[PDB]
Design a protein around this ligand. Sequence first.
Ligand code: HDD
Ligand code: HDD
Lengths: 726, 726
Amino acid sequence: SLAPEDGSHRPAAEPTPPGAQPTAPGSLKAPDTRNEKLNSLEDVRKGSENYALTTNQGVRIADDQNSLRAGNRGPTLLEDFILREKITHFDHERIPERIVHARGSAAHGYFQPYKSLSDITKADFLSDPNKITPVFVRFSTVQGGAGSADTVRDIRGFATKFYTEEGIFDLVGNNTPIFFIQDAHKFPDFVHAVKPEPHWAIPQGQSAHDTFWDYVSLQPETLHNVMWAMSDRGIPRSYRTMEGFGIHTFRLINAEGKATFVRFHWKPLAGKASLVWDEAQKLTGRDPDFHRRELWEAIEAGDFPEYELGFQLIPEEDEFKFDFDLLDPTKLIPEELVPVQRVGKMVLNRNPDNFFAENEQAAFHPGHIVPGLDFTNDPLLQGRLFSYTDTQISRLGGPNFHEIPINRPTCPYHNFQRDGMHRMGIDTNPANYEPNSINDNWPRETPPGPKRGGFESYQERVEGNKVRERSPSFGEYYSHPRLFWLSQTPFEQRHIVDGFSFELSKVVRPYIRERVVDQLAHIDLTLAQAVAKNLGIELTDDQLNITPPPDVNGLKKDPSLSLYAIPDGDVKGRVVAILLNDEVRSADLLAILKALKAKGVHAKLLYSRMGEVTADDGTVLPIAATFAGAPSLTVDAVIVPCGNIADIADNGDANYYLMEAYKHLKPIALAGDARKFKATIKIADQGEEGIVEADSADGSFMDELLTLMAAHRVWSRIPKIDKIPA
Amino acid sequence: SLAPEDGSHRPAAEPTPPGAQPTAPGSLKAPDTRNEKLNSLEDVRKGSENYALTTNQGVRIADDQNSLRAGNRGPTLLEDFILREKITHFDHERIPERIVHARGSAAHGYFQPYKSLSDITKADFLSDPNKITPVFVRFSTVQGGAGSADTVRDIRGFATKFYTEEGIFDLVGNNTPIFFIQDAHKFPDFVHAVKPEPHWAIPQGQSAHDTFWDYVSLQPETLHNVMWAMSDRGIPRSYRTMEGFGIHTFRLINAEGKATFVRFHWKPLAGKASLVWDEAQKLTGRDPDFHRRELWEAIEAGDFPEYELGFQLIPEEDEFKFDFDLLDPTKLIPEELVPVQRVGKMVLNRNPDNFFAENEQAAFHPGHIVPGLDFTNDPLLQGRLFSYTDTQISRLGGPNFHEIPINRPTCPYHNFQRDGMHRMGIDTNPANYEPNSINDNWPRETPPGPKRGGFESYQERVEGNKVRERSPSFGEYYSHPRLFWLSQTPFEQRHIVDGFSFELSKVVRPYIRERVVDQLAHIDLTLAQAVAKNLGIELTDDQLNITPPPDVNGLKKDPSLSLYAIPDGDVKGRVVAILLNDEVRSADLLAILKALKAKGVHAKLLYSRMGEVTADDGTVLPIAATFAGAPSLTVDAVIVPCGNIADIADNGDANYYLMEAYKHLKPIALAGDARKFKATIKIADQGEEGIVEADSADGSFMDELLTLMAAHRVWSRIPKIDKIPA
Ligand code: HDD
Ligand code: HDD
């Protein structure tokens, strides 16, 4: 009726590259992609086609265009129950956003272990290489609201809901291996300091303001995670190209009752990759939804995000083996000292149907563990256990949040709990208490055991007085920031310097900048001096003579802490901008697209207008976006084929497209007379590494380009970009 | 004591220009700024200095750094009531955001009428020129969440709470004179279409997506307000430089019972000023809080936002004398036919103390009127009256939202309502019903009268059948969009074309773009043709033969609809970037700052690092921000004094500063050897209009620059900017 005659409104129910088709609810885009959790949601999924429009009570609506009034130009009547029901539901759509991590993007998937881990844990989802566990994963920022932007400088959340046969296990982690603070009692202080300031509620999604750096300067325990946030780790290219960490030391418990200390890791199969600051900041304006969009479209394209689960394992007798306290969440465990042992793989392969119902209402909580796992006395973890249950009473409207469909266990659950707001389950048990005789005491307790047993805490020894006191072993603040610093490449170190420098320049009270620079001088004097230089601060002789902190158990570096030191690039799922002209050389475009498709690299055809152009072939080329509509920020490299280059040679948008990408260190490839654009980016006739150029886009032209893309960015270009006006 | 000895942590409690000092709660920044509402809030204002840190129950806390645990490396104890109270409050901080207009910034102020209006309304706050009414005003966007960006393309809200002696009057308006839809029954449809789409919750703060333009293409009633949104009205420079409108026709009722139709207007004393799209979009990334910050800092500087309240007045016998229906909210009343008559002045002169408590919790509702005002049968207004009461039950936690301090009337309030969540008032009335004898029927009804009388509705005639039916008089959709289009300058028209073009290029389904272009052809074929060519669309012969709509009561143009046809910009409160070098020519800087001060124009001194530089005469210049930290987006003009120009001539950030300013049509002034920068912006030796240049910054130099600033932007430069790579 209102759909177009040609059916061009519906996306195909098959994988398609980003921007090819309109995005769609997961059940409509990929109906053949299934798992036990997705199937269990069938009871609450609602269709639409061939159904009448009704009230919520089932009454068909004849006229959904008008209120009921006395005369067609008269007052609206109170008896219009259809209008009032519709407006009432609208009026109450919103619920409180998460206190932290309010901005997030989520997807369905499954996990599978590589081998049985029965020797170290009795957890059922790790017991058998053929046990598939559905998952729901939500990635997030930390500071900003649910409507804030994606590519901010911040920590990222990485929360995984495991729907196991013995209960929900929530692995609630971040993208760095430590947190800012040591004891949960300080969590409201730290969060209030990083959040928008209370008088005017500025700034959104940014730590670059006085109260954050005030707190940091007075609490050196924060410096380690601050180092990570100021590095390019704070601006990932994609949720698909960052690491995950549980941060805390947990425990594994095997059938014989032996405990092993464990820290959890997620390693991205797509490799580690981050933006650079100028690109990330501008991208929050050009596309505040970039990461959300990029995740959704990768899944629709079949570039399923994949992550390997890994364990750092520490025997109980090695609790005190390292310089740092194992239970201190501001300290990491270097992989040089304790390797990450691979455990299994997780694949995210379907988007939700309704963002609010599945993402916004999802509730993750690290206290949701299962038999075979346990906690430790990490005093940050200890307080988290209180928070994630408590907070849901207001956010999700009461204690039945486990009945919201996305949150439901796929395994059975039965107990004597009753009532509460929006109670869905109707209990037939004659008893609502135990011990009872009137239902023969069902449901019954289960003794602990090797499988399908009841939960019992590990009986660890407790000895001490009731004290509010920090462990002295936690009182070391500079050695891990320094190890992180020393493990970065030189260009990563420069980016850290520029992060501190840019943020401290937004601090209005100069003494705070100075006090932060003083803390940096306790970490590394090269770092401190470089930041000071950019702030017009001069270190004193006392600061220049601060003794550096000790090495971490003899380490001078750990290359696993760098994003880039150990190559792990993968071009699959990346995207290239192809800048068209009105008579493209079809031979160039043919060879370009063939090579990109063979490596799984997507392309977007850009022009100065929408519609189509015709190549020299007579081939009609559809235009994905304009140069301004899809800035170089949104792509990984730029290719300019030959053709009628005079068409775009004096186009300001086209020339700036290349300058912006050049500034942000991206690979650029120019064919034929497109090489004339070298003048725009101040490249000499002789060329330079990172600019592919040839008479035509044939032979090794695309191999060179794809090799550059596998290395992510052209770091050697950095000394040249400070002269580029872009 | 953690504060610096020199007291530099504390801003001065006197007016200071933007950036000079840290911002502060209004009671601390401007303690002497008072009004009756601000005084009435004193009962709930909390101090801090010289108080002990306590629990919410008043118990002093000894150690706010640690949880209570069994041993200093032990588990946290459930008996830690201090921890659990602190974390519980943190866990429940967030409340639901507003369904629409969730993003907004507010201030305190006062209103005064110019003359008694007793002849046309018995409203007490308009009865006496010596009667001052306190106000609380919230400006907002519409689509995005509370954490979204300020300078988006959107309609803006302009809500004013008048605390009158006869009750609260809320004037809840927008910055355009019409709304998108005719009947409130369709509000959830329109809002769902513009909001982030439901499968993936994209895009934030943007109408540039499929579902919005789908709805528009199928509901031509939306086209008038769409035209306004696509113009530079949709991207204001500042809440201080936009207009406000009540949109609906309301009624004024005088003491003799005579009704006059009225539409409400706010006219900014700072004049009308807007950004351009590329600037606004980039600014949502460089400073998503730009409007919130600019409002707060203008008030701290003494640049108080001021607006003139004005009335369009139509006698009852003139109801049907126009080509359009007065009760249709998609139609404006041209000022050429019905002039805005000046009524009074509103000054916003103090910021809040706590954003959440005063801004986030404020509740405005257009059903809050007072005797002397009444409604009409406008079917959008009619449904609004239901919604603003209903929505607060969830957003503010129940029916006692009028007891939240910011919402409280300053006049008396007494009735027989009782109980409800968070009930504050403790009633002593023996009776909670009327009629009653046990309290001699107090509080009592009051007959209507000329002053201090009870509210009685105007007894307008109602005749017709109970129908869900649109008024035939509303069935015209193109003549007011055409009137707006033909009232704009040629460069405003270009920006409208480019607004439609940019947004429709982000619509993935091409037939939606085609259907919108077809709607445009029913408005004006020059507009339709210009948009279609940017989309690669060819109008058909039939489309080129669509008859345009007629003039609106003889009007092709109304001058009041253009932002700029008659410039009315005050330069006071604007800001100029001054690009420093390491040996600035002090004679230049003296002349520059002398002239800016005389016009109340602020300055920010920028450089490549923070700290200080020394001028050629030894003056130490403090640096406000770096070139990258305070981009040209954030200022109105750029001046480059002479000095050691070689220091910055090769700086890529400095050159780009000018190129970005140039592209966005801002005045630029270059003294002495700084004229070398003309090459970067491709200005010929001979000069051009909008680039001020001379051997030195003298008297004539700064007059030319400030004359350009008075005209806001250099529109004559538009033909040159498409060749600039920026
Ligand atoms: C004692 C308070 C407290 C502390 C110390 C932490 N958190 Fe937390 N976190 C919360 C209290 C909280 C919360 C208030 O309970 C949130 C907000 C809303 C919610 O459901 O849980 C939350 C949300 C939250 C989310 C978002 C989950 C989602 O997508 O819904 C993640 C990923 C984390 N946290 C991760 C961490 C990590 C890695 C921490 C340090 C190791 C951490 N949190 C410390
Ligand atoms: C029947 C539904 C409905 C309709 C047709 C409208 N609104 Fe509305 N408006 C609401 C339902 C609503 C609301 C849902 O009740 C809000 C959101 C939360 C709230 O407190 O009120 C609101 C908020 C709201 C605000 C923000 C107030 C603040 O700062 O808190 C403004 C300025 C407006 N509206 C203005 C308008 C204008 C100028 C309209 C057309 C002439 C309009 N609204 C139509």
